[PDB]
Amino acid sequence: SSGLVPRGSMESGFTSKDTYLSHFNPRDYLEKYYKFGSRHSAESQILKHLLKNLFKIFCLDGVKGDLLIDIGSGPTIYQLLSACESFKEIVVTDYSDQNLQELEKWLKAAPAAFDWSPVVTYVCDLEGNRVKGPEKEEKLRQAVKQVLKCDVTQSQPLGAVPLPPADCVLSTLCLDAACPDLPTYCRALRNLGSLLKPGGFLVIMDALKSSYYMIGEQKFSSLPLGREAVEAAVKEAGYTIEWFEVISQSYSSTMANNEGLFSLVARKL
């Protein structure tokens, strides 16, 4: 559709999930959003905000437990660096098979995997320089017990895979790209609840008011949600919000039309 409309959206109005299998490149996305050609870019500022928020949630607040399931990880691992200090076991999941290939290369420490070292050092500094980068990466690698296929739009997001009830379900920068509408968004929060213990933690971080995002020239849909619609959907899905933060920092105009980002910690009712 020549960029007139997002990829895989001509017929339905929103990028169909199989576009994440046929027309999606994790390496290109990683280079664009997590490897920086210049300092103090909007992408770098957003990543530092996410990292300080994850550090605050997992290391300063009471978000601790046995199992954490990361839903819609993408090809990234920055969102698990601080979580590995408070959770014994981490299960990482994604819809995209090429994202899963990217995570398994990182898990094996394959030379062809994306290099997360500068981000790891950054988290080590936040945490008090208790350890250096390599010791921090090895701890996270040992904490990641399973790499699974997921689909937030299904009532059993992880299929037949058996798992104990989780203490936390984390989802960063996934739901705006996976849910075509507010009813799907609410159903997806309910589907995630099925993986969670009663009183378990739900941690969500995503963009606000974004109808699309770019990976170079490739455009993908995003559910344009404001902060009120996110709170109403989280409350309707069966959770009580403990804290909710909105930041005005947005991605570069050539990468997305978001109007900030939100972070929330909720508990299953």
Ligand X SMILES: Cc1nn(C[C@](C)(O)C(=O)N2CCN(c3cccc4cnccc34)CC2)cc1-c1ccccc1
Query: Which residues, 10 to 29, sit near ligand X by CB under 6 A?
Result: 17, 20, 29
Among 258, 264, 265, 268, binds ligand X (CB under 6 A): 258
Measured CA to CA in angstroms, residue 103 lies from 108, 226, 254 at distances of 9, 31, 27
Residue of 256, 264, 265, 266 interacting with ligand X (CB under 6 A):
256
Number of residues that bind ligand X (CB under 6 A): 26
| 68 in contact with ligand X (CB under 6 A) | no
Which 160-199 positions form the footprint of ligand X (CB under 6 A)? 173-174, 176-178
Burial of 258 (0-12, 13-18, 19+ CB in 10 A): buried
Residue 94 is a binding residue for ligand X (CB under 6 A): yes
Ramachandran region of residue 186, left (φ > 0), alpha (ψ -120 to 50) or beta? alpha
Coil/strand/helix, residue 249 = coil
Separation CA 133–CA 137 (nearest Å) = 6
Is 151 annotated as ligand-binding? Answer: yes
Count Cβ atoms within 10 A of the Cβ of residue 260 and give its class: 0-12 exposed, 13-18 middle, 19 or more buried.
middle
Give the nearer residue to ligand X in terms of CB position, either 32 or 268: 32
Do residues 264 and 234 touch, judged by C-beta distance below 8 A? yes
For ligand X, the closer CB: 17 or 64: 17
DSSP letter for 58, please. Answer: I
Length of the chain: 269
Nearest CB to ligand X, comparing residues 74 and 124: 74
Part in contact with ligand X (CB under 6 A); list of ranges 50-58, 129-137, 145-153, 193-201: 145-153
Kindly state the smallest distance separating residue 116's Cβ from ligand X, in Å. 15
Residues making contact with ligand X (CB under 6 A)? 17, 20, 29, 33, 72, 74, 94-96, 99, 150-153, 173-174, 176-178, 207, 210, 213, 222, 251, 256, 258
